[PDB]
Amino acid sequence: TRPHASISEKVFCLIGQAEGGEPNT
Amino acid sequence: TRPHASIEVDTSGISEKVFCLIGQAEGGEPNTVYELRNYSQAKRLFRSGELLDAIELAWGSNPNYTAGRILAMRIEDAKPASAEIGGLKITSKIYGNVANNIQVGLEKNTLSDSLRLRVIFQDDRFNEVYDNIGNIFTIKYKGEEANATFSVEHDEETQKASRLVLKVGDQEVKSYDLTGGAYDYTNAIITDINQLPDFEAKLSPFGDKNLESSKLDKIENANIKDKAVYVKAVFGDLEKQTAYNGIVSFEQLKTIEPFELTKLKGGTNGEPPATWADKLDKFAHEGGYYIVPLSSKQSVHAEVASFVKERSDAGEPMRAIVGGGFNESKEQLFGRQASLSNPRVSLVANSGTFVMDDGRKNHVPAYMVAVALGGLASGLEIGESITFKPLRVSSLDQIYESIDLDELNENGIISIEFVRNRTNTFFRIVDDVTTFNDKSDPVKAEMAVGEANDFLVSELKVQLEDQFIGTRTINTSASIIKDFIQSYLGRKKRDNEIQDFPAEDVQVIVEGNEARISMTVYPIRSFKKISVSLVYKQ
Amino acid sequence: TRPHASISEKVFCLIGQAEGGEPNTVYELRNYSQAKRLFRSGELLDAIELAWGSNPNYTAGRILAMRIEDAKPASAEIGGLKITSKIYGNVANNIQVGLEKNTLSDSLRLRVIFQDDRFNEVYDNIGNIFTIKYKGEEANATFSVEHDEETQKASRLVLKVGDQEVKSYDLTGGAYDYTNAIITDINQLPDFEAKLSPFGDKNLESSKLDKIENANIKDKAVYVKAVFGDLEKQTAYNGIVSFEQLKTIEPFELTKLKGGTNGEPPATWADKLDKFAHEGGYYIVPLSSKQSVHAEVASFVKERSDAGEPMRAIVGGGFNESKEQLFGRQASLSNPRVSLVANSGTFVMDDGRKNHVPAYMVAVALGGLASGLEIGESITFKPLRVSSLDQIYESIDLDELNENGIISIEFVRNRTNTFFRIVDDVTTFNDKSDPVKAEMAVGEANDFLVSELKVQLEDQFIGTRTINTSASIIKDFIQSYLGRKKRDNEIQDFPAEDVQVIVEGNEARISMTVYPIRSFKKISVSLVYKQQTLQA
């Protein structure tokens, strides 16, 4: 991996359906 | 020499980017790149065939624009024509079959006890003679002893000249070392004989010889009272006579001997190579951008395409333009496209005819229209497109017309369109679409957008490098990166290299070991659809 | 001798095979012309001239050059002289010398020739140091010199008049050491006279007078000669050739010198690498070809590290080496402070010639760069100024060579211009989590810091005043040093709480922590293109 160039305090939560991402995390 | 004035009525030519051509032609030393800056230089490095007709086309495909400097390579392992005749290895500076026409001979002159050399070659009208070979200088002794001589002995380990000695009877009058010493150039002998009482030595008037003294030949006890005999040194005089000129060179295996005027042998272009990648490797660091191979073979098209992708992965963007055959069919073309559907490649269909400047109404294959096209595309300013530009082609051997110029262009194949008048040559090129399958993305799809991206990207790379990748200190967080990048983008908008950019839509993230950047740019590219509407008030 | 007018820190070393200079000595070169006066041809000279022109902006400092051949001076014993040349090696056989007798002076004349410098000046009226006369009416008068028989140096000079001795000149008992004292003192006499040579500032000693007696003199101007001493004074202090006397000096023809020889290729360089042990040259670039000498340089740098002195070696390998041949050097050259360079290319030398360059000399390009740069600065991504280079290795190859600890080179394309830059400051060391050893510039920052820290610990505590300096005092002194080094920004940060020291009789043990300046090696970008509106 030699060096290179490659080219709000109120947190908000959600919970619902989605076709992606592992659940329970 | 003396002060003077000169006027050459130079026949040269009868600009930013560089253009690369690899093809077949019958001259020039093989497997080394050349830079061509002048057509009249190409007619002299090379001689005949596609590589030269390609260059004569590339630098004339448009009456106002023209290609930059050209890099060339020959696709042949041409041997040089040579022979062993006499005690000399004769080798021709030409590489290829053409060199077999060369003729060399030697004859000895009685009136000067020297050789006369003749070299002849037909196509360059070269037929000249060199005479008095040897004769490097004379001596006459002037003392009044009965009969005096001189001698010149070799270094028996190397056949180089070792001493020059003057003998009056049995007495060594004088002597000089020739294995280097004071007398490395013959000039010092020409003083140090004359300045003695009993001897004088003088040069021949035909040119300054002044050879390196180790090149004389072995002689012993030659009378120089009854005669003004020559010192000979017959081989090393050939370099002073002929080295800087002409077509032939001479090398020693042994004694030099006369021979009849005889032809050479072994000038062979050889079989064409079964693969082009090994020689294509040499363009990797010569600074090209646009490359075209001068052949219809499908293996060459796949090797060049894979080569361009390998270069693009290693910091050097490149692009290939390819043609195929003599008037190919749709089935053949889409067969070539489907096998070669990667970006940074563009495929051309038509095969044209060009009025070549000899007066030569040349019917020309598709991979040569790709030269004419690639030459024009390379010469223009960065970010312009071949889109709707005219080409100086004479006529086309073609199938494709307006409805086909939907079909082919929609599938990513370029073609030239016939417009009946006023537009300079009646012919303009419809698009700059690449061979990549998916047309939705313009950077991949359309050549000019890519060609503007590739150099813009390199500049962002190079400027970020020394400002940050140098790692001069960590105490320069991500807020400074936003300052540098907005300053950088502000220059590109001012310099017209981009259309516009939003300044307050830049996001930077950093973790000390790595920085992450996000930015948006609004690109600049040629118009392609003009929808102008008309209304009135009746 | 009369008053008249007429018209960086990191020291660098070079050592290799070229023509010229004394065998087994180090020379402090500081300009191009000084180099060409010392050496004549060889890769050492290209390396020197490359060091001060690998980059126009960054350039090396002082150059310590060594020419590693057991060379001999060319000599030939002829006439009455131990003729010897100053220039050791093969080249000196090209010298020619002759001593011609010249009759109007009744002297010798010297001509020395050497073709590469076309030297060819002449030294004339050799001998003939001064002239003598007598005026008086005495019919018989004469001059003589008599010698110390144990050395045949002259010990008396005498004048006779009227067939008896007049006066002694005591040629070791005063001012008569120098010939002038005889010429003045004769000029004080009533009727004896003498005049100095019109040929120049001879002022030779009387010790080197030649054997001569009963020179009949009155109506004459006879020369005293002193030939050998005149040869030394008028010639030995200039030019290529040197003379010593064996046997009497007399004329002989123009002839070559002989036996000048370079010797055999050096088998071991270690006992000649001892000459750098006190000049402190930090970077060293051996031009040695073979892996055997690279291991010797590696052993040498390790031995100087154990001695306390920091040094680092940059090395190259062959022509057209493959990855694996370079891995076989990397494994056999394992220790840190040794830096392996890959490719072999070409450079545009002083001549304007397209010189081919092996990796042994391409190493000099990085050595000239790292010695030019500021201390602690990284060699990474700086230009290299190379005309052509066997450099087909691609981006994935750079990662493989770099990970394995092999310095590589890259082609980079600007807008229109191009240039070649060096892709990482890595060493030949294995461990990825130890940047003090894995990164040349970090090791350098550590070395130069430690060279000062050692000395300031000596001056403070091995003043040896008393054991009563308890560990709290050492704990304070480390705070002073870490504060002074933070002030000059040589360290990023340090935790002042983490200084622990224990003292036991004459022995102390120390521990601490330092935040070194962190790098910024990787940058990633996410570049997006969007449509846009512009309107009336």
Residue B291 near residue B120, CB atoms below 8 Å: no
Residue C342 near residue C359, CB atoms below 8 Å: yes
Residue B155 near residue B166, CB atoms below 8 Å: no
In angstroms, the CA B169 to CA B127 distance is 48
* Chain A residues whose beta carbon lies within 8 Å of the beta carbon of residue B457: 7
CB under 8 Å to B491, separation ≥6 — which residues?
none
Residue of A nearest to C407 (CA): A2
Query: Which residue type sits at B263?
Result: K
What single DSSP character describes residue B386?
Answer: S
Query: Which residue type sits at B310?
Result: E
In angstroms, the CA C273 to CA B349 distance is 69
Handedness of CA C409, C411, C414, C416 (dihedral sign): positive
Measured CA angle at B33 (ends B31, B39), to 5 deg? 125
In angstroms, the CA C429 to CA C426 distance is 8
Please list the helix, strand and coil fractions of chain B in percent, rounded to the nearest 5, in that order. Answer: 25, 30, 45
Please list the helix, strand and coil fractions of chain A in percent, rounded to the nearest 5, in that order. Answer: 0, 10, 90
In angstroms, the CA B255 to CA B37 distance is 45
* Chain A residues whose beta carbon lies within 8 Å of the beta carbon of residue B461: 5, 7
3-state class (DSSP) for residue B159 = coil
CB under 8 Å to C513, separation ≥6 — which residues?
C494, C495, C498
Cβ distance A1 to C522 less than 8 Å, yes or no, reads yes
Spatial CA neighbour of C259 closest among C40, C411, C82: C82
Spatial CA neighbour of C339 closest among C427, C431, C438, C435: C427
Of C378, C391, C523, the CB nearest to B515: C523
Min distance A3 CA to chain C CA atoms (Å): 5
Give whole-number Cα distances, C459 to C321, C448, C455, C478, C499, in Å. 50, 17, 6, 13, 20
3-state class (DSSP) for residue B114 = strand
Tokens of B2: 């003396």
Query: Which residue type sits at B465?
Result: E
Give the count of alpha carbons within 13 A of B256, CB side only.
Answer: 24
Helix (H) or strand (E) holding C398: helix C395-403
For chain B, what is the radius of gyration of the CA atoms?
34
Measured CA angle at B508 (ends B502, B511), to 5 deg? 175
Cβ distance C424 to A2 less than 8 Å, yes or no, reads yes
Instruction: Count the neighbouring beta carbons within 10 Å of the beta carbon of residue C311.
Output: 22
* Chain B residues whose beta carbon lies within 8 Å of the beta carbon of residue C521: 469, 471, 513-514
In angstroms, the CA C54 to CA B92 distance is 39
What does the DSSP assignment read for C479-527? Answer: HHHHHHHHHTTSSSB--GGG-EEEEETTEEEEE---BPPP---EEEEEE
Cβ distance C522 to A7 less than 8 Å, yes or no, reads no
Helix (H) or strand (E) holding C161: strand C153-161
- Method underlying the structure: cryo-EM
What does the DSSP assignment read for C182-215? Answer: HHHHHHTSSSEEEEE-TT-----BGGG------E
For chain A, what is the radius of gyration of the CA atoms?
18
Enumerate the β-bridge partners of residue C12: C63, C283
3-state class (DSSP) for residue B201 = strand
Please list the helix, strand and coil fractions of chain C in percent, rounded to the nearest 5, in that order. Answer: 25, 30, 45
Q: What are phi and psi of B474, to 5 degrees?
A: -75, -20
What does the DSSP assignment read for C45-73? Answer: HHHHHHHTTS-SSS----EEEEE-----E
Give whole-number Cα distances, C103 to B155, B314, B527, in Å. 37, 80, 99
Instruction: Count the neighbouring beta carbons within 10 Å of the beta carbon of residue C506.
Output: 7
C116-120: long-range contacts at Cβ-Cβ below 8 A with a sequence spacing of 24 or more?
Answer: C116/C40, C116/C91, C117/C240, C119/C239, C119/C240
Interface mutation target, options C524, C527, C528, chain A, most CBs of A under 10 Å:
C524
Q: Residue C200 CA to chain centroid, in angstroms?
A: 35
What string of H, E and C letters represents the secondary structure of B292-318? EECCCCHHHHHHHHHHHHHHHCCCCCC
Give whole-number Cα distances, B89 to B82, B86, B93, B97, B104, in Å. 7, 8, 13, 18, 12
In angstroms, the CA B307 to CA C14 distance is 41
* Chain A residues whose beta carbon lies within 8 Å of the beta carbon of residue C525: 5-7
Min distance B277 CA to chain A CA atoms (Å): 28
Where b means 16+ CB within 10 Å and e means fewer, C44-57 reads bbbbbbbbbbbbee
Of B180, B464, B521, the CB nearest to C94: B180
Look-up: residue for tokens 């990662």? C399
Residue B210 near residue B204, CB atoms below 8 Å: no
Spatial CA neighbour of C221 closest among C197, C200, C194: C194
Min distance B451 CA to chain C CA atoms (Å): 11
Query: Which residue type sits at A17?
Result: Q
The answer for B132, left when phi > 0, alpha when psi is -120 to 50, beta otherwise, is left
Enumerate the β-bridge partners of residue B95: B80
Give whole-number Cα distances, B340 to B20, B300, B330, in Å. 21, 11, 15
